[PDB]
A and B are shown apart, each in its own frame.
Chain A
Amino acid sequence: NRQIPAAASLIQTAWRCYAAENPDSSTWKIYIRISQLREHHRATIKVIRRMQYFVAKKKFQQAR
């Protein structure tokens, strides 16, 4: 079944996009390159997460 990693990943992207609307989530801990997280960082990170979702949406439709 190749619908698995596309499924797995759409949950994972959906939730990462939801969690980042919380400024105290553990989801901000994955950014080990950035020393202290400024707001302009969280700006670009919410955008990258939303892009990463719309791709995972397109890739799950294609396997569903």
Chain B
Amino acid sequence: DQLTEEQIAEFKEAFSLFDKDGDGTITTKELGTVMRSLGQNPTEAELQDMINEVDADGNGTIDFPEFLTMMARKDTDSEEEIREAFRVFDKDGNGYISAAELRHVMTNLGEKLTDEEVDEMIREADIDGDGPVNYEEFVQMMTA
């Protein structure tokens, strides 16, 4: 890509928001205050899950360098994983999911998106009339 810009300035303010006390580290409590603030009710299981995925070493908290690494992130590899996750609902594995099936798993299981996000999502792939949605289209539209 490019050398990070004045986004340095942006990401540090963002790290500021979780780092309530300025100790240059973000803890599960600190992430938990922010999320509940947002009306979310995460488990001390979930917080530790998020924390571990960005703690490069293992001091069990996030410093700013790790934070930067996280907000600066994978060629085709991250593309292939989503492309796989769709293939799990590709019944025949043709390469198309139905709009109804897509809508259904999107609304009814996993993170249970809302009816009006599925709409934005089906609408971002201009379906060939009433046709089945090509999800490889989706995945390129997403990553690029």
B85 to A52, Cβ gap below 8 A?
no
Q: Is the interface of B mostly helix, strand, loop or mixed?
A: helix
Q: Which of B70, B88, B116 contacts A3 (CB 8 A)?
A: B88
Which A residues lie within 8 Å of B78 (CB)?
A: 57
| 10 examples of A-B residue contacts, CB within 8 angstroms | A8-B85, A11-B86, A11-B110, A26-B117, A26-B120, A33-B39, A47-B14, A55-B53, A60-B81, A60-B84
A50 to B88, Cβ gap below 8 A?
no
Which A residues lie within 8 Å of B127 (CB)?
A: none
Is residue B96 within 8 Å, beta carbon to beta carbon, of the partner chain?
no
> Which residues in chain B, 67-120, are within 8 Å of chain A measured between CB atoms?
70-71, 73, 78, 81-82, 84-86, 88-89, 105-106, 109-114, 116-117, 119-120
Which B residues lie within 8 Å of A10 (CB)?
A: 81-82, 85
A54 to B85, Cβ gap below 8 A?
no
Q: How far is the CA of A4 from the CA of B70 in the complex (A)?
A: 26
B85 to A11, Cβ gap below 8 A?
yes
Which B residues lie within 8 Å of A14 (CB)?
A: 82, 142
